[PDB]
Write a protein that binds this DNA or RNA. Structure first.
Ligand SMILES: [Mg+2]
Ligand SMILES: [Mg+2]
Ligand SMILES: [Mg+2]
Ligand SMILES: [Mg+2]
Ligand SMILES: [Mg+2]
Ligand SMILES: [Mg+2]
Ligand SMILES: [Mg+2]
Ligand SMILES: [Mg+2]
Ligand SMILES: [Mg+2]
Ligand SMILES: [Mg+2]
Ligand SMILES: [Mg+2]
Ligand SMILES: [Mg+2]
Ligand SMILES: [Mg+2]
Lengths: 115, 206, 98, 153, 100, 84, 127
RNA sequence: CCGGCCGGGAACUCAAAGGAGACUGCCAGUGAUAAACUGGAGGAAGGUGGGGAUGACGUCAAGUCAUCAUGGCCCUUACGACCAGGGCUACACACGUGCUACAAUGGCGCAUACAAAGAGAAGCGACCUCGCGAGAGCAAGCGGACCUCAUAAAGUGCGUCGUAGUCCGGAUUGGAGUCUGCAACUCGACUCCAUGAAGUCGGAAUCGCUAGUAAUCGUGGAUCAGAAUGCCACGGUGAAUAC
RNA sequence: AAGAACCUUACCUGGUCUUGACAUCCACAGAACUUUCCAGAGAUGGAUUGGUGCCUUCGGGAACUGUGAGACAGGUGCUGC
């Protein structure tokens, strides 16, 4: 119930639980379970410690949690200090993939700031 | 309000098409452009001859142009020296062999296009538009049209406020689809601007 | 077998065409299977009518390609030449096939 | 409308029981034109309530409806300054429609799980005058009783 | 439209027809997958050197009677306005007002 | 982005300028308009004035811009903020 | 001998052949139970037979095309109705009083210009 | 070789032509013995059956000189023309019109049924092989009731989730990629992996709709090299209400 | 607006052209056409391999190109009062 250094829920099925690892979604969770030979509908608190060890080994293959976080952070910071268009967009906290900013863009710009 | 074209709303019902050539999506655009060019050239070169209608068919890599005209002698000329040149140029424009056939139009006074052209020519010549309209209506109702409506719109008589005036006699039931409403428009480029003439002629039913 | 595909923009005219097709193919001696009506292609177009704005003011036009099929099983030698010399009226496209 | 409606639309009685009353109930419960889902939910609720109680599905449904059906409602009339909440007696078709609608509103607003469970529980409560539906009927009758002075109209 | 605009379109059509074959060849090298890296590179460079107006994507359909770049209809080669006018005057075969 | 089968895209004239400038040493900034061109590995150290609509923004090419369009480092809009 | 009828509903067309037999109903080479998932559809198919009380003494061979489940069910119902019409004319009054002879002439209304659907106008605002 | 597959059949569904039908025609009552109305039979349809096209005289000196034509004025080493880059895609904000949601009438997984209408020749692209997928290779067939687009989805059967900002919800962003196009940075669509936001039904106010309509589910087309949640059509399921 | 990456595009920054990109008409020269090299962001300018014909009053015209003055051409410039 502690894979890649984080607590994962014991009450949920294995596929749903493994998605709690920052870096594993449904697809990677299914791949991990298949490679470790564990049913997709088994609940975490009902796996043998050997099975959890194998799961640890599998999830160790992929970059997750802190390593992934700092990888993403160094990619963003490289964009930043290069100061290309995407670096400038990231600095200003505006949409980065060519969306419209005349309206919407609330996810990047934050909620309404009245004048 | 605006009104539907008395020709278009009746094309499939009591009118014919001014073009009955069949072609597929590869040929439709080119044939339409060539028909437009031929009609434009014919009208420009036969402005004097009073060409009432131009029908175009394309049987098989050929173009047949029937020119319903009011002065067939004028458009043909001596023997056929004029229609021969017209056919040559039409064939050159269409890129295919041509065949021009002149059609007798009896009574230019019951044909909407010819009435409109006459009225526009008078307007260019600066005749009173009320007199031109009354003459047109009287001529048609004496030739025996069951009804006629004439409308002239624009800067009539050098006015600075454009207005629309229309005379009418008999019946012109534009809503009945089976009624024979021959309708046509023309423009008169006067020195005070453009003046639009529209003519409806109701000639009968089925 | 001889296959005649008649395409026209007018059902009355195409009916005239196919009638005289079958009359010629029967006077020549051969027997005919038809005419067969194949579905009309109703090509529809929608166009704004004002030169400026007014989006809800539209005309809807329609082009009805009518199509008839003529079959000539047992194609007589005179039948073939008669059909190919017949020369249909304008406004009809005829495709001849074997 | 200012003219008059023709006869009401024909309704095909539901297959399991052949009751147009239940057909109307299914239609009222239906959402986004998913009559299959509505019928399955209604049928599950009916069998569940029949099993919990003992009554036949149809008669138990009738009892639950009757405990919710109103008799007089209030409509608005204009004279001036204020409005009259005039009490008017209801016709039976509107009675059944209102009873069904109130039952379905209460069932949807209940906090259970499957809507069949919600509907069975709500109808069971109506079978002894407990649901939000019977509460709404209570409110309607006591409002009409309060406004009874305007009944003469 | 403008006479200059129509002239531009004519020039683009002429260049596309003139240089069509070479563009076809070079794009064949590029999208061929068993062509050497040197071949694909030189083909990219030569396709660059070919004039831009040769690209058939550079063209813009125009109403042949007015040059209008909007509202085109490929079946007729005209914009909506010209199609409406000709259709009502009967200068389009078979076409007539639809109702269904 | 560009399909990998087609490889990277460099405009021929900019490639010529770059190869000649690199083989003939440090020179004037490469005045160029090819914003759509790719920064190749042998681009380092070159100062290139990439057009942006009215100006030729100078860009000192370094290692970490390899594989990026030169037009990305020359912004084409001006913005400082509303009612500052 | 086989008695034939045609039913239509929405855009469904159902050819229905009836011949006296053991009460077997075949829809598109498939039994009714596993061809129609909706008990409403099964009721719709069997409605004329049960209302004329001839449910077991006829055999149905039916082929239907076009439409959806309910449209096809109505097409089947119309097909049996007409097949029994041309079987006997005596049950005509009963079937009309029931309301099965009538072909329900209700199609999907065409979409119109300036509306989102048949009648759903775009949302209007004074300003 | 269970596939109309082949021989065949012309019945049937369909395809397209031509006809018939519905007219207040008949009956009853009401009604100024009139128009007509309230019903009833018959009939597929009963009262202009449903829908569409059809927009009267005229009103707003309403809109368009940027489709076009056009009087008058104006520019003409130019206010015309050519070219490459950029912008029309900018964002403290405000409004309109929509899409997806806020979940269990649901989500996900597996199996499976039922459509109409349209398109297509530097076009639609089978089958097969490869790729996890966008797609790639070879490549038939078809200007077509033949071939392709193109397995409809909602629905049904089983399991799962068990009310939680959640297997809801999909924004945003990182990495890796496919296709079109000379070229995808400004500024494309799509795919895989990852991230997983706001949102728990929305104040005053306000909109659409009386039938196969609303609601809901998918499909096609025009424009188009690529680029729809828009627009225009098509069918599937399918109500409540009108005193 | 039935669909702005370049085009569209009418706007902006620069590089350029002015009887002009597109029309007639005047004269002269030259068949056109095709390919190739340089410079320039491209426009555009230098060249030039090949080509030098189609009818013929065989001498010239028909086309297609450049040049040379124009009469003009061009305007998505204003005015929908
Ligand atoms: Mg112009
Ligand atoms: Mg384009
Ligand atoms: Mg709209
Ligand atoms: Mg009328
Ligand atoms: Mg204005
Ligand atoms: Mg815009
Ligand atoms: Mg999800
Ligand atoms: Mg398409
Ligand atoms: Mg497209
Ligand atoms: Mg629909
Ligand atoms: Mg641009
Ligand atoms: Mg005005
Ligand atoms: Mg005004």
């Amino acid at each position: 119930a502690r894979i890649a250094g984080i607590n994962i829920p014991d009450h949920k099925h294995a596929v749903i639980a493994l998605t709690s690892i920052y870096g594993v979604g449904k697809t990677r969770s299914k791949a991990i379970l298949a490679a470790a030979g564990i049913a997709e509908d088994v609940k975490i608190s009902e796996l043998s410690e050997g099975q959890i060890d194998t799961l640890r080994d599998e999830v160790a293959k992929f970059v997750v949690e802190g390593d992934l976080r700092r990888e993403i952070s160094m990619s963003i910071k490289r964009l930043m200090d290069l100061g290309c268009y995407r670096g400038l967009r990231h600095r200003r906290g505006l949409p980065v993939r060519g969306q419209r900013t005349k309206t919407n863009a609330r996810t990047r710009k934050g909620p309404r700031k009245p004048i | 309000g605006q009104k539907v074209h008395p020709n278009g709303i009746r094309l499939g019902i009591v009118k014919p098409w001014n073009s009955t050539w069949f072609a597929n999506t590869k040929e439709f655009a080119d044939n339409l452009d060539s028909d437009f060019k031929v009609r434009q050239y014919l009208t420009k070169e036969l402005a004097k001859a009073s060409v009432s209608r131009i029908v175009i068919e394309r049987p098989a890599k050929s173009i047949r142009v029937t020119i319903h005209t009011a002065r067939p002698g004028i458009v043909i000329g001596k023997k056929g020296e004029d229609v021969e040149k017209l056919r040559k140029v039409v064939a050159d424009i269409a890129g295919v062999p041509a065949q021009i056939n002149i059609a007798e139009v009896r009574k230019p006074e019951l044909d909407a296009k010819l009435v409109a052209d006459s009225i526009t020519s008078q307007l260019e010549r600066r005749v009173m538009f009320r007199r031109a309209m009354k003459r047109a209506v009287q001529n048609a109702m004496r030739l025996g049209a069951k009804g006629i409506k004439v409308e002239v719109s624009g800067r009539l008589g050098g006015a600075e406020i454009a207005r629309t005036e229309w005379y009418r006699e008999g019946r012109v039931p534009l809503h009945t689809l089976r009624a024979d409403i021959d309708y046509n428009t023309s423009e008169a480029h006067t020195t005070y601007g453009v003046i639009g003439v529209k003519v409806w002629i109701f000639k009968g039913e089925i | 077998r001889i296959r005649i595909r008649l395409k026209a923009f007018d059902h009355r005219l195409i009916d005239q065409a196919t009638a005289e097709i079958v009359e010629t193919a029967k006077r020549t001696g051969a027997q005919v299977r038809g005419p067969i009506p194949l579905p009309t292609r109703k090509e529809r177009f929608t166009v704004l009518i004002s030169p400026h704005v007014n989006k809800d003011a539209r005309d809807q036009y329609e082009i009805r390609t009518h199509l008839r099929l003529v079959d000539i099983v047992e194609p007589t030698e005179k039948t073939v030449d008669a059909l190919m010399r017949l020369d249909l009226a304008a406004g009809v496209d005829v495709q001849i096939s074997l | 409308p200012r003219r008059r409606v023709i006869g009401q639309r024909k309704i095909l009685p539901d297959p399991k029981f052949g009751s147009e009353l239940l057909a109307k109930f299914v239609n009222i419960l239906m959402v986004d034109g998913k009559k299959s889902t509505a019928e399955s939910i209604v049928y599950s609720a009916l069998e569940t309530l029949a099993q919990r109680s003992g009554k036949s599905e149809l008669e138990a449904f009738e009892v639950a409806l009757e405990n919710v059906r109103p008799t007089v409602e209030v409509k608005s009339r204009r004279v001036g300054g204020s409005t009259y909440q005039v009490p008017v007696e209801v016709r039976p078709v509107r009675r059944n429609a209102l009873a069904m609608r109130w039952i379905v509103e209460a069932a949807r607003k209940r906090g259970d799980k499957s809507m069949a469970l919600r509907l069975a529980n709500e109808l069971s409560d109506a079978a002894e005058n407990k649901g939000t539906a019977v509460k709404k009927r209570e409110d309607v009758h006591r409002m009409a009783e309060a406004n009874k002075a305007f009944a003469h109209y | 439209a403008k006479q200059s605009m129509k002239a531009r379109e004519v020039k683009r059509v002429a260049l596309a027809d003139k240089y069509f074959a070479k563009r076809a060849e070079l794009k064949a090298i590029i999208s061929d997958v068993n062509a050497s890296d040197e071949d694909r590179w030189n083909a990219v460079l030569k396709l660059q050197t070919l004039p831009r107006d040769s690209s058939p994507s550079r063209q813009r359909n125009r109403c042949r009677q007015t040059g209008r770049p909007h509202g085109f209809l490929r079946k007729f080669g005209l914009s909506r306005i010209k199609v409406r006018e000709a259709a009502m005057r009967g200068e389009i075969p078979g076409l007539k007002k639809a109702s269904w | 982005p560009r399909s990998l089968k087609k490889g990277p895209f460099i405009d021929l004239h900019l490639l010529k300028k770059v190869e000649k400038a690199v083989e003939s040493g440090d020179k004037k900034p490469l005045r160029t308009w090819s914003r759509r061109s790719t920064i190749f590995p042998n681009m380092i150290g070159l100062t290139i004035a990439v057009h942006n609509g009215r100006q030729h923004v100078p860009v000192f090419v370094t290692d970490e811009m390899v594989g990026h369009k030169l037009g990305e480092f020359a912004p084409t809009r001006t913005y400082r903020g509303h009612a500052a | 001998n086989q008695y034939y009828g045609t039913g239509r509903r929405k855009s469904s067309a159902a050819r229905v052949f009836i011949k006296p037999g053991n009460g077997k109903i075949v829809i598109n080479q498939r039994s009714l139970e596993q061809y129609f998932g909706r008990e409403t559809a099964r009721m719709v198919v069997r409605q004329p037979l049960e209302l004329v009380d001839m449910v077991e003494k006829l055999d149905l061979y039916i082929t239907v095309k076009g439409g959806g489940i309910s449209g096809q069910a109505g097409a089947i119902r119309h097909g049996i109705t007409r097949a029994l019409m041309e079987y006997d004319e005596s049950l005509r009054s009963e079937l009309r009083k029931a309301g099965f002879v009538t072909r329900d002439a209700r199609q999907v209304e065409r979409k119109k210009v300036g509306l989102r659907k048949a009648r759903r106008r775009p949302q209007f605002s004074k300003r």
